[PDB]
Design a protein around this ligand. Structure first.
Ligand SMILES: [Zn+2]
Ligand SMILES: [Zn+2]
Lengths: 139, 47, 66, 17
């Protein structure tokens, strides 16, 4: 279903609160994003990890140069956090993503996996900044 | 759902500060920061 | 700190005249002629442009942001 | 205050660049 898949969709507004938070390769790795490829067609890709690009760009108020190593079945390339859209996974896009996953041979993640992974972002949002992370963030 | 929005000292940048947290700004890092105007019905009589 | 809106004694509006007073003093006019060129006959209203101190500039020097 | 999108702020595409 597309409705259950949109629970872990990392919108463009949520990513602005974890631009310098540690453990970025643990909570983010597993969710899906509607990266804009482009004319209005979109392609859902899996978050394999985290990369850093050499180009610095501004995203509204804040600004980050980090990349996002995504992959849609087999085609993989470097992307940016500015091209991500806030729209939800449509039925056509969901069917295209399912077909790409079936063709690539990657097993579809189980429903329990998404159910237990959606809580990671919720628990990280309310995380008390008691340790020594503010200094790294400001630096 | 009010995260107690505060304003930095010199940078004048909005910061979300909760209880049991150090009072430091999201960048640079200072120790002085003020609050925002209330949302109440501030109504004066021009007398 | 800022020009008042009206003269305390009389009540004539003087708030809309500080900038014009500065301009007239700027060009060539001096105070004794500028005051009656603006239209201030009573001596009570003339203190508003002579006695006033413009402290709002120093306050504006402490810009909050940028 | 999770995501005040209200759509968005004109999201850029990859190939336009
Ligand atoms: Zn700080
Ligand atoms: Zn007077």
């Amino acid at each position: 279903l597309p409705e259950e898949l949109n629970r872990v969709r990392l919108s463009r507004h949520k990513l602005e609160r974890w631009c310098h938070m540690p453990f970025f390769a643990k909570t983010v790795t597993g969710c899906f994003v509607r990266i804009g490829i482009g004319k209005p067609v979109y392609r859902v890709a899996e978050i394999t990890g985290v990369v850093e690009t050499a180009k610095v760009y501004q995203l509204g108020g804040t600004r980050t140069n980090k990349g996002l190593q995504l992959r849609h079945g087999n085609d993989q390339r470097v992307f940016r956090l500015e091209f991500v859209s806030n729209q939800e996974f449509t039925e056509s896009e969901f069917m295209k993503w399912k077909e790409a996953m079936f063709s690539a041979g990657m097993q579809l993640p189980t429903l329990d996996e998404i159910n237990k992974k959606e809580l990671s972002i919720k628990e990280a949002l309310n995380y008390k900044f008691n340790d020594q992370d503010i200094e790294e963030i400001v630096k | 759902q009010q995260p107690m929005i505060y304003i930095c000292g010199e940078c004048h940048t909005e910061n979300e500060i909760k209880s049991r947290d150090p009072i430091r700004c999201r960048e640079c890092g200072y120790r002085i920061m003020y609050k925002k105007r209330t949302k109440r019905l501030v109504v004066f009589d021009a007398r | 700190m800022i020009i008042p809106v009206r003269c305390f004694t009389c009540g004539k509006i003087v708030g809309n005249k500080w900038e014009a007073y500065l301009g007239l003093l700027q060009a060539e006019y001096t105070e004794g002629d500028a005051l009656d060129a603006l239209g201030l006959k009573r001596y009570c209203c003339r203190r508003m442009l002579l006695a006033h101190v413009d402290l709002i500039e120093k306050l504006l020097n402490y810009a909050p942001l940028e | 205050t999770s995501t005040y999108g209200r759509y968005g702020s004109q999201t850029p595409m990859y190939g336009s660049g």
